Design an enzyme around this catalytic site. Structure first.
Site, short mmCIF file in Angstrom:
data_model
loop_
_atom_site.label_atom_id
_atom_site.label_comp_id
_atom_site.label_asym_id
_atom_site.label_seq_id
_atom_site.Cartn_x
_atom_site.Cartn_y
_atom_site.Cartn_z
CG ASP A 1 -2.19 0.87 0.96
OD1 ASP A 1 -2.53 1.13 -0.21
OD2 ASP A 1 -2.81 1.29 1.95
CE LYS B 1 -3.02 4.70 1.31
NZ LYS B 1 -4.37 4.08 1.30
CG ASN C 1 0.58 4.46 3.81
OD1 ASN C 1 -0.16 4.92 4.68
ND2 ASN C 1 0.24 3.43 3.05
CG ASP D 1 -1.28 2.39 7.65
OD1 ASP D 1 -1.43 1.23 8.09
OD2 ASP D 1 -2.24 3.12 7.33
CB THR E 1 -4.45 2.76 -2.98
OG1 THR E 1 -4.44 2.69 -1.55
CG2 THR E 1 -5.19 4.02 -3.41
#
Lengths: 433, 223, 223, 433
Positions: free
Chosen positions: A120, A122, A125, A141, A161
């Site tokens: 994840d 992105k 984060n 995260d 995502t």
């Protein structure tokens, strides 16, 4: 030694605290017992183990997991999002972006070396340790992170995502460490020009762009970007994960390990300007809760399916069985409340209503089609789903409304869209009241 | 656009149209019907009654090509039945209303009364099943569910917002209507779903969108 | 008033108050909290720390008399329990919303679709029991009840609007919430009553209040 | 010969028509059969008979009642409301108003001579034949008119418009022709200064003003009004209907029959200005449908009753039986759901709950009092009515809400407000769930 509150998690309270014996401060994510849901505890156990395993300057470090009331004490990070800090700077160049990506790659390389895939990556984060000048980039995260075995690929589920999902995940192929590197490619692209390489209002087409690797470097903004930066992006956004550059290899790419020699230092004001709009669209499309919006825009191909569906329903309301047998396949099958849970086949079952109900007298019928959704499954096939609302006059003379939910499957046979199957739930479509 | 008479004659296609044809259009598309040309008057317009000398005789292939597309779209959109399509292409203003609405729902689910009183107007009114057909005013009625259930109960719930429709009624006012689907665990530990329909009226006061009234029908939000 | 700091020192009572006391009030009632005097600073204000030379020593009987009334009202309004009182003193703006709402209800009862489409926005949305939890858009859904029941049925009905509450959300937008009580004759010729709760969102467009959205809960308006 | 549409009645359609053999036009109120309700047909029969009986230049004349589809063909009246025409004029004086009242009195005198009492004289029923210069005033709408026998008074029911109701009707006394003359007095008053003699936001106090004849002629606007105009108003607004001037006598009052000698001709711009506001308030307060608004404003006396009611309910929620027996009369009676339709008396029945329920444990109770309405029935007596909403925790742990409707009667005994009776419907007030 607690102090101020920083924010809220779904189940937790984040608050500044301290290590009193050493006057070093931290951030505390209280586990508490607000909920303890099944996959909520299974994930928390996973996240704590993973964060406990990773000790790296560019990764948010976990320092304890007390269970006095249960704790998740992390590094105090007060710099906010990297992307927010960048728009605030006066000067921002490729070299600045390269220094950021080098730290991100270092964190990603550390994860992969310890058999962990973030999944994840992105902007949200990517945090800054503090508001200080050269504050380090920190990866945050690991709620979606997974533990892999060496270099073995596997299907760990469809997660991530949309804008950053890798082609292999969208293809439902087994995957692993390279998905993080595809995400890094999307992130680097945005860091250079301030808009994403893959964007489409329609998620299905977005995923088609990603799987096809359909991005480009449009002029004029990319004309001032060095060949080495473009080269690194191309090596990250490589469709075939087996040919995609790894974190280790990316750390030794000229644009990274020769930043001081090949990376441009020109200020990119247009990138800062666009990134500000990018951050504003992101904060506004947060989608705090699951939001579903029925397809309003429709391609001509999808409009064709809506039209023929409405023609079919009109033939029904008008009792035109000739039209009905033109539009429906002779081998039509159906689930419908009138059939009492049986699958019926052919035309006979439906002809009973054309012969005994669809030619009523002073009994007005008004049909409303609500929120139709069309799937195109090849050039000659589609299915459509919609709510069917029927207003009608009952036996006692009063107006009433009934609802059905309908699925219809269409095959273009001999050049004509024909309905081979339909499924109705809810109320029958002939006023039984 | 129609009420504003907001049409124009873009180049290049209109560069080859005669002034007299543009003139007749202008006189027909006059916003004020008292000043609009009548049928009797248009029949005397030079482009109509002196066509031989006024109207162009050039071929307009680009008009034919465009009419083909116009006709094709018109036959595709030919709605045989009343069709109601949701909204999915939202302006930034409408997305703002969706966001603050979801922030409010989130605060309710998390039992954060501070966020609730920040987002809701102090004079909030409400129709809701919990209120048994009465119009309730203020925060008192809603405070009960925060101080007790919303944080007391420890069970997983998932909220879904279906088919939101936003009306912009001025620069500082908006209306949103949506279906609220709630998945939750019942007393026996079995999964259940419930539906509510909800209207929320929003007023931008002191630079912040704030909820001045809402109306829930269907199921009550507490399981 | 509070957000605007809209207070003053009316004559005559304030004519005899010292400037220093008015000054201290001004510094406490500073809208911007960053510029408001602190407790430490007020303790050094001349009216506080030099009272002997600054504060008046005149008797303020009119303050005592007024405080008696202030205290009496405060003890009467002491709400031991949450009390919700309807609205009955309406501005002209709020009465305008009530009037057009009642004009709309009247048009429905009389089955006048022309008046209905005049008062309702073409893009009207609605939640109502007749729609079975769906959000309906346009006039189509409502046209059915006009073209049939609203004029076809020949029975007496009496509508009552209870406890209307109007929110003004800008110069050209408003919200109204009310209980709709309907007395009517049932099939057996027996009198019956039904209740609905209704929200209507109004937008002033082209100088005319128009209904852009409504939400009915409870009974459906057709008997 | 039909033509244009003029407006809508509750059950009828008004449309311009013609008498083709004589080229004289009319207005047609179609009876139709949209409804035919009981007292709807009984009233229509009455109105048609009455309008058929009255043939006078200052009264809207009925010319037929065909039943081909059934008709009510009246005189074509196109001048609109008298009050609207007046605000449009450049000059308006007492003399203009007197000429208007003379015509109104002529129409009223004609009604009374034929044994008919209008009962609803008000601006909306005062029309102008046409937009022409000296168009005649015409009395309209006999939907509330009654047929009286000579000069016999009787109770014909409480009917009329609040601002114009006579004292005898408000006293529930038998009445007759004079009620129209009281209305004329209110109308004349408004015609001179442009605001009503009796006005109050609270209808009950309005009726007290009317019954007491509590109006006055405030300066400066009344300082320019002639003594004769004031005298006529006083003779119309006479509380005792037996002493009130009649239509016949009013026609011979100097201000009427000597208008050209005693009536002022000064333009009254302030009257025109105020009348414009009067017409605007009237059009805005039309109350198209029955509108009920719970009393928000409260006198101190009514606030006292709300306070003591809330103190009583608090003692109940807190289980303070000492407070309960202080506030409640020892001979208290009650209807309540817990009593299963029986009238209970004394304290015993209520003490059971103080002893076994009002001291629950971790079981929060929240009571909401909704839309209280207080009647003051003498200096030492009142009753209050309100919705009682109770939020509470049920047996299964979930929050719930229940509703009761409560009436409580209060008598000030030995200087203390005490509750002598209460009536609860709806749910019980102790969580039975």
């Amino acid at each position: 030694q607690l102090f101020e509150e920083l924010g809220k998690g779904a189940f937790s309270v984040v608050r500044r605290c301290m290590k009193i014996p050493t006057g070093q401060e931290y951030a505390a994510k209280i586990i508490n017992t607000k909920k303890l849901s099944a996959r909520d505890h299974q994930k928390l156990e996973r996240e704590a183990r993973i964060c406990r395993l990773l000790k790296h300057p560019n990764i948010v470090r976990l320092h304890d997991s007390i269970s006095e009331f249960h704790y998740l004490v992390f590094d105090l990070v007060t710099g906010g999002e990297l992307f927010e800090d960048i728009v605030a700077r006066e000067y921002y160049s490729e070299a600045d972006a390269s220094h950021c990506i080098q730290q991100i790659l270092e964190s990603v390389n550390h994860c992969h070396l310890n058999g962990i895939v973030h999944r994840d990556l992105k902007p949200e984060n990517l945090l800054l340790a503090s508001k200080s000048k050269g504050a380090a980039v920190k990866l945050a995260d690991f709620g979606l992170a997974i533990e892999v075995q060496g270099d073995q690929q596997a299907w760990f589920g469809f997660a991530g995502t949309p804008g950053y999902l890798s082609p292999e995940v969208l293809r439902k192929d087994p995957y692993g460490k390279p998905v993080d590197m595809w995400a890094c490619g999307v992130i680097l692209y945005i860091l250079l020009v301030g808009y994403p390489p893959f964007w489409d209002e329609d998620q299905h087409r977005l995923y088609q762009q990603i799987k096809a690797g359909a991005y480009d470097f449009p002029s004029p903004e990319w004309d001032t970007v060095t060949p080495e930066a473009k080269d690194l992006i191309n090596k990250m956004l490589t469709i075939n994960p087996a040919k995609r550059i790894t974190a280790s290899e990316a750390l030794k790419h000229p644009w990274i390990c020769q930043r001081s020699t090949v990376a441009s230092m020109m200020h990119r004001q247009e990138t800062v300007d666009c990134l500000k709009k990018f951050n504003a669209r992101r904060k506004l499309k947060g989608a705090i809760l699951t939001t579903m919006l029925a397809t309003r825009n429709f391609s001509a191909r999808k409009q064709e399916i809506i039209k023929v569906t409405e023609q079919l329903i009109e033939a029904i309301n008008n009792g035109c069985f000739e039209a009905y047998t033109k539009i429906c396949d002779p081998g039509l099958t159906a689930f419908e409340p009138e059939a009492l849970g049986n699958l019926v086949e052919g035309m006979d079952f439906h002809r009973f209503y054309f012969e005994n109900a669809l030619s009523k007298s002073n009994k007005p019928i008004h049909t409303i089609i609500l929120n139709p959704h069309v799937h195109l499954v090849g050039d000659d096939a589609a299915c459509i789903a919609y709510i069917r609302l029927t207003q009608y006059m009952d036996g006692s003379g009063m107006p009433k409304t009934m609802q059905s939910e309908e699925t219809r499957v269409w095959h273009r046979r001999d050049g004509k869209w024909q309905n081979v199957h339909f499924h109705r739930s809810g109320s029958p479509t002939v006023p039984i009241k």
